[PDB]
Design a protein around this ligand. Structure first.
Ligand code: CTP
Ligand code: CA
Ligand code: CA
Length: 427
DNA sequence: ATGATGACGCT
DNA sequence: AGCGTCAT
């Protein structure tokens, strides 16, 4: 009892932009606002591939990875915006720059960990302590939490249900105990309301957020009420929430490990994991995974919010599917040059912006027939931000993968090329 | 024939 | 070093 850690030591939020690329294109082109629309890449094959879908279009069944021609069968009025194409490949600069807008606003409030182009974790523990010292111990008005859901509460319209739950939560809150984890989460949610208001005011972009005691629960919380809402998942809410929560919904369990937990243990839901000892879970899934699962199914996780806003690698890739697979030496060399030129542009901007230089170039390829992301990776020194040198060096390190006897031909044909600059040093 | 990109674990 | 897993 008195010696059992409860994983209530931190306040962590996860902020996730709603249909991010669609919002970027809707900000730029007001004719797309409040419409079923989608963002596509490429255009000639089946109208292009859908990468992002507005909530109006999702109501028709339009999803990511669908071909736009097929999405138009579900939603004939679907509007489309296309990703910029430069040197024959998709160019995502517009969305990376919009991402920086949002991340810089979030960084004013707290240390953030960039998790993807449109997600960041926030460690709010210190900011909460400060706010509890200020204006205390005054009660927290529901007006400070206008878009917050309390998971598990209450207990015929959506907003009435939201407010009934918020009222039940605020009425039970012990506002005189500055160390109450539930109070700390509530103040965390107040700050996240302020952060999300600042993002929307200064960029036009809406987002969702989760607030809890660790990254996994904050990520789970964020998805419970999308879009344009935030959700607080308390430690006390975990047993009911996990009791019907498919294992695959928890971050890192969406793949082979999660499938093996289900198959080996014969369970379906996250809460069912509590019945196993730590040693049992370590025996099936390894020491690290087993300890992690034992704590996580109790709502406890210690992965820190890392202080990192910049990517550790900068990379450029293109797939060559089907009959387009690269099959001549001139083809491989020309596309390596195209990738190297885009990479040079990104690296030179990175060096000016962030005072650092990459020192290693990783070349990844996939060969036709291979189901893996990469069939082969090789690396060489990155000593100059020069596209011709980078592309020549990349060819040098993959040259002898070519099994073809004819010198102008490449066998087996290449279905992906990927150049990645890594091992940054201060500059 | 989604495709573009990124973090991190294992050996 | 080079491959495997999981993710947005
Ligand atoms: N299979 C995937 C999933 C996502 N992404 C990248 O991750 C971004 C954001 O992904 P996600 O948050 O899943 O989708 P949103 O469009 O933001 O929709 P939501 O409102 O559900 O968050 C996408 O724009 C895309 O750049 C991707 O490349 N490939
Ligand atoms: Ca998103
Ligand atoms: Ca996301």
């Amino acid at each position: 009892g008195p010696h059992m850690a409860t994983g209530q030591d931190r306040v962590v939020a996860l902020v996730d932009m709603d249909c991010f690329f669609v919002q970027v294109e809707q900000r730029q082109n007001p004719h797309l606002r409040n419409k079923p629309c989608a963002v596509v890449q490429y255009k000639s094959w089946k109208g292009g591939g859908i990468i992002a879908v507005s909530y109006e279009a999702r109501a028709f069944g339009v999803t990511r990875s669908m071909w736009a021609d097929d999405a138009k069968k579900l939603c004939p009025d679907l509007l489309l915006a296309q990703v910029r194409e430069s040197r024959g490949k998709a160019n995502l600069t517009k969305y990376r720059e919009a991402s920086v807008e949002v991340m810089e606003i979030m960084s004013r409030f707290a240390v953030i960990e960039r998790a993807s182009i449109d997600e960041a974790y926030v460690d709010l523990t210190s900011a909460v302590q400060e706010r509890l010292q200020k204006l205390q111990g005054q009660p927290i008005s529901a007006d400070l939490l206008p878009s917050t859901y309390i998971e598990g509460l209450p207990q015929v319209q959506k907003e009435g249900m939201r407010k009934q739950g918020l009222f039940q939560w605020l009425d039970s809150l012990q506002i005189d105990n500055l160390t109450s984890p539930d109070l700390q989460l509530t103040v965390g949610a107040v700050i996240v309301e302020e952060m999300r208001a600042a993002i929307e005011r200064e960029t036009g972009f809406q987002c969702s957020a989760g607030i809890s005691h660790n990254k996994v629960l904050a990520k789970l919380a964020c998805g419970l009420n999308k879009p344009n809402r935030q959700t607080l998942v308390s430690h006390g809410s975990v047993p009911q929430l996990f009791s019907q929560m498919p294992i695959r919904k928890i971050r890192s369990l969406g793949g082979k490990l999660g499938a093996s937990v289900i198959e080996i243990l014969g369970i379906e839901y996250m809460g069912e994991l509590t019945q196993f000892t730590e040693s049992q879970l370590q025996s099936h899934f390894g020491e690290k995974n087993g300890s992690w699962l034992y704590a996580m199914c109790r709502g406890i996780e210690h992965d820190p919010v890392k202080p990192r806003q910049l990517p550790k690698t900068i990379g450029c890739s293109k797939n060559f599917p089907g009959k387009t697979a690269l099959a001549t030496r001139e083809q491989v060399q020309w596309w390596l040059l195209q990738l190297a030129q885009e990479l040079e542009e990104r690296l030179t901007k990175d060096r000016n912006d962030n005072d650092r230089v990459a020192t290693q170039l990783v070349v990844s390829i996939r060969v036709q027939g291979d189901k893996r992301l990469s069939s082969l990776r090789r690396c060489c020194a990155l000593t100059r931000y020069d596209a011709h040198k980078m592309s020549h060096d990349a060819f040098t390190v993959i040259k002898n993968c070519n099994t073809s006897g004819i010198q102008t031909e490449w066998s087996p044909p290449l279905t992906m090329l990927f150049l990645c600059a890594t091992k940054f040093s201060a500059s």
